[PDB]
Each structure stands twice: as C-alpha cells, then as structure tokens.
C-alpha cells in the first residue's frame, strides 16, 4: 500500500532558448531505441533539440537504462496525451512539434488508427498552432485528420501513411 514513490512525474523545467519535442504513442524499447539512433546521428548536423517521451505505463528496466545513457538529451514522463493536465506538464504549447508513434504490428489497424487520431484531437484541442506528425496505418483514416478544422498542412502538419508509402 505504501509502495514506492512516483519515479516519473512533475513538470518539465523551463529553460531559456531551449527547443524540445514531445513523442507519444507506442513508447516501447524497439521504438525508442530505433528513433533515438536516427534522431541523434553524427551524419546529421547537430541541433540542440530536447526529446520528451510521454507514456501511460511505467517503463521497464531496459528502457530506464536507455534513458539514463541519454540523460542530458532525453527525458520521460508518465501520463496520457488525452489528459489536459498531463499536456501542461510536458509543455506542448512550447514544443517545436509533437510526434505520435504508431504500433505497426497491431492486430486491428482500425483500432490503432482510431486511438492515434484521438491523440491529435487532444493535442489540437489544447492548442491549434502545434506541428503534429503522426504515423498512419491505413489510408482511409487520412480523411478524418484532414477534416479537422485545426489541421493545416501548410503549417507543418504531416501524416505518414504506412500503407500508402509501403505500396508506393
């Protein structure tokens, strides 16, 4: 009943002239390790961009060690993107962009796409002027995101359709 103290929580500390992004969705050891390797590569020109991860379930021991090795550039927070309180903690309004990862190996592509679409609505509800990049499983779900009044492709909003690119 006493248990242990909340390992991950609180509000991200603000810094002057600091650029950060929010990554949500499928936060597992496969996605985080692969994303961090490509995001932080020596070939790409180095830019001071902070990476903030938001997820509901606490990370396992393997993911915690990965975050430790990237202590000065990667942070993790416990919470859901559907909660406006949790959105304030990670400071989405000050984030350069929000990245929504998707579970490619999912039993129901419709269920995965519907959950990811709801995440964009929650982010756009908090503030419309946020760049959102989302991975999409099926092409017919792209119409729902385009019909959102706050969705603007000219402002940087992008949809990465796995089915469209794979078959292309």
């Amino acid at each position: 009943l006493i248990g242990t103290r909340a390992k991950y929580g609180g509000t991200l500390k603000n810094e002057k002239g600091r650029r950060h992004i929010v990554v949500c969705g499928h936060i597992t050891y496969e996605s985080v390790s692969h994303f961090l390797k490509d995001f932080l590569h020596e070939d790409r020109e180095d830019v001071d961009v902070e990476v903030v991860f938001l997820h509901r379930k606490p990370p396992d021991l393997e993911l915690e060690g990965l975050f430790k090795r990237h202590f000065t550039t990667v942070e993790f927070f416990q919470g859901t993107i559907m909660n406006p309180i949790d959105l304030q903690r990670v400071k989405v309004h000050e984030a350069d962009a929000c990245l929504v990862l998707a579970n490619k190996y999912c039993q129901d592509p419709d269920a995965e796409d519907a959950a990811n679409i709801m995440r964009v609505i929650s982010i756009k509800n908090y503030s419309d002027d946020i760049r959102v990049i989302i991975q999409l499983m099926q092409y017919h779900n792209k119409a729902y995101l385009l019909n959102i009044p706050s969705w603007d492709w000219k402002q940087g909003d992008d949809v990465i359709c796995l089915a469209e690119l794979k078959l292309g």
């Binding site: 559907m82 269920a111 709801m118 929650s122 756009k124 729902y144 019909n147 959102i148 009044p149």
Partner: protein, 450 residues
C-alpha cells in the same frame, strides 16, 4: 430533450438545469456571461398551493401578478386531475396546485401567503400516416441532392446492424405533435445503415415526412446531399456498445463527426450549423469546443458546450429520481412538455404491440390540438423589437403575455457581445435585466388555428 432542441436550440440545457438542485451564491467579480448563466442554474421546479386571493382570476392575470409582485414565474397549474402548461382563459380555482420556478422553496412560499392586506392518431395528439413502407423512404445520393431540404432535421446515427435499439421514435414523434400545422412540420432525414433502421421502422411507419439515407454521416458527400447547412438542427446519436478500452475513446465517433461538420464550407460555413451531440462519457465534452479551458474535475453543467446547448448526456437525468419521489406531478409535467403530450392510455395502446393506430377526428378529439408549445422568438424584428434596444426583461414579459399570451421562460444571447456565434442559456432573468437586439427568448406559444 433532443427533439425539443430542434424546435428551440438550447432548450435541453434549460431543461436539465431546472431539475438539478443547485445552490447559487452571487459572486463579486468574475466572467460576465458565466455569472448570468450560473444564476439561471440555481432555478428549479417547485410546487405550492395558490393563495385564496388568486381565486376567481384568469391564469394570465395570475402569473403576471406573481412575476411583478412576488418575483415568481408561474407556468403551469393543475385543474381538477390534469396539468395545463400556460392555460388560456382558465380560472384559478380553490386549492389549486401551481408550478413555480424559483431559487429555493422558501421564495415559493410567498405565493401561498399573498394577500391584499386518419389525419391524427386515436388520442388526437400526433399526426398519423397510412403506414408508409421503409423501401419507399430510402433515398440515394442523387435523389437527395435534387430535392429541396430547407429547415429540416438531420439525424446522424452511428449504429451497427446488431447494435441495441435506442428507440428512434422518441426523437421524431415530439416533432410530429398536433400543436404544429402540417405545413410547418419539420422534415426528418436519418443518415445511417438501413439494416439498423429496418429494425426501428416498426414504429416509424405512421409518422409523416420521414426520410432515410444510406451511408455514414462522417462522409462529406452524404452531408452535402442532405444540405446540412440549411437544416434547423443536426443531431448526432451513437448506438454502438462501448468497448470499455478507454473512457476517452468512447465518443471518438461523435467528436469526429462534430468536428468534420464544423470545418466544411458551402457555396455560409459549417461552423454556423446548429448541432447537438450525445455523449456517453462526461469527460469527452472537452473535445467538442476549441476556444475554452478544459478541466477533468469540472462539473458537466459548468462546461461551455453544455451551457451553449450543444452537448448533452444522460448523467444529468439522475436528479429525476429524487424529484419524482417528492412530487409525482413534477414528472408528469416533464413528460407532457417534452414528449408532445403523451396521454396515459396511448402508452397502453403502444404496449399492445400493434404500433401507433390512427383514429377519425371529431369535434371532441380536435379540441386536444389547443395547447401550448415550446418555441423561440427573436427581438430583431416584429412588434416586440422595441424592448430589444434597452427594454427590461420584465417589460417584455408583460407585453408578450398580454398581447399574444406567450410566456417568456429564458433568454438565448451570444456569449461575446464584441466574433463567435455561440449562445448560452439564461433561465428566468430578473425583471430588471437588460436586453439586447440580438437576443432570443424561450417562450411557450399558444396554438393558433388556421
């Protein structure tokens, strides 16, 4: 409540707040429109025996005196066995039970101490039709585009063929009451799967002016076919079972449909389309609106979408259990005001299993058509426009009652007086309240033959 909102937008919010027991403290300084809205939320139904001083006077003079003197709104009385809503030319008899709207039961006691010192059905309350077939009511994309649909009602239904039945009568029949003439009846079009509506067509055979369009209301092609930009009210109803995977994902279907319509452009934009949305979870109301602050712990009736008559949920109906026990007549007034006057043995007719059966109209039967109905008016034009500029609410209440017999219940004005066409509900403003030319008044309209 959704059907009543079609006739008068924002009526569902006024109905829900009038049965939830809320204690209202006046505040020194806060947001102006919230302060007016919160004062209305402190109003609820109350019943009290009328004073003997009121004996022998008509109802119109009785309710006018209560508003001017006792600052109480009398809207219904009981004549004995039956309840009449704003009766015309009805005397106040001895020991009469009256229905009042007030902040608390203490204020209501002043009324007791006042002193000088085949066209219609068998019941004749709803219109009837000779059991039109479902196949004749099915329309295609080109069939619905070529026909004119102005001032109609669009019912966005999300239901699987195996989904539990939600009783699509309860939304259509109140719109088919005998209070409305056949020329002023609002056309009803249902957008959804025909397989689900087929099971619902048993009790919709005899209701005139019903249209069924196959497809999904999410698609923009179906919405443009039925001309959603010209409809009086767009209703979003979901009948699918909740998967219980996540509370925030329960209303993903209705939220997407509401946002899709708000963004469409017509050759008039979709943001001005009046819509009402059904929510299975209270916490999903935060995604219905964009220009507002959201809080998980806030109460549903405190939210902006609910205050504007846009969002609705069954959680606000739990207060009816306590209200019914303390007074059986309170629930009877509820049903007669929202169901279009559903007489008792009419449910006995419905319980038989043969559906709605019609009857031949007689002089005795046609007398039931004369009763008050829920309506909304505007002060921009007409003979009541003089009070819009600077006239007080009390002056409008007396003038409307004396001239046309209409009983003003509340007001429906824009949230911002200056940008956005959002209107919130004020229930029973004080007699000294100031009006605006862009105000809409909830009134109880008498039946005018012809």
């Amino acid at each position: 409540f959704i059907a009543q909102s079609c006739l008068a937008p924002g009526f569902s919010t006024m109905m829900a707040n009038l049965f939830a027991m809320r204690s209202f403290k006046t505040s020194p300084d806060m947001q102006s429109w919230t302060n007016d809205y919160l004062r209305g939320t402190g109003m609820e139904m109350y019943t009290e025996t009328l004073s003997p001083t009121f004996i022998g006077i008509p109802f119109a003079q009785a309710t006018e005196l209560c508003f001017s003197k006792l600052k109480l709104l009398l809207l219904a009385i009981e004549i004995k066995s039956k309840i009449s809503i704003n009766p015309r030319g009805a005397k106040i008899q001895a020991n009469t039970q009256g229905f009042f709207i007030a902040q608390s039961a203490d204020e209501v006691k002043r009324a007791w101490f006042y002193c000088k010192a085949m066209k219609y059905d068998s019941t004749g309350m709803f219109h009837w039709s000779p059991a039109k077939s479902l196949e004749d009511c099915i329309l295609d994309r080109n069939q619905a585009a070529m026909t004119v649909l102005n001032g109609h009602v669009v019912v966005c239904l999300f239901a699987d063929p195996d989904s539990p039945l939600i009783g699509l009568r309860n939304l259509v029949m109140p719109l088919r009451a005998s209070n409305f003439h056949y020329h002023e009846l609002k056309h009803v079009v249902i957008v959804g799967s025909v397989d689900y509506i087929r099971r619902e067509w048993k009790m919709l055979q005899n209701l005139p002016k019903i249209s069924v369009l196959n497809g999904s209301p999410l698609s923009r092609a179906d919405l443009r076919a039925v001309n959603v930009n010209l409809c009086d009210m767009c209703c979003i109803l979901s009948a699918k079972v909740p998967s219980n995977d996540d509370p925030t994902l329960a209303d993903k279907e209705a939220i997407l449909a509401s946002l899709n319509i708000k963004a469409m452009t017509f050759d008039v934009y979709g943001a001005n389309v009046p819509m009402i949305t059904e929510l299975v979870n209270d916490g999903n109301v935060q995604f219905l609106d964009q220009d507002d602050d959201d809080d998980p712990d806030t109460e549903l009736y405190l939210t902006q979408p609910f205050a504007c008559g846009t969002a609705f949920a069954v959680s606000v109906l739990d207060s009816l259990m306590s209200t019914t026990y303390f007074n059986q007549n309170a629930l009877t007034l509820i049903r007669s005001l929202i169901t279009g006057g559903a007489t008792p043995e009419l449910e006995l007719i419905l319980a038989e299993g043969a559906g709605l059966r019609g009857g031949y109209s007689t002089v005795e039967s046609l007398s039931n058509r004369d009763r008050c109905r829920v309506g909304q008016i505007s002060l921009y034009d007409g003979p009541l426009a003089q009070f819009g500029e600077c006239g007080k609410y009390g002056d409008l209440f007396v003038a409307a009652l004396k001239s046309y017999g209409m009983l003003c219940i509340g007001l429906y004005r824009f949230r911002d007086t200056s940008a956005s066409s959002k209107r919130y509900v004020i229930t029973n403003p004080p007699d000294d309240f100031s009006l605006l030319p862009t105000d809409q008044v909830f009134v109880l309209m008498q039946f005018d033959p012809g």
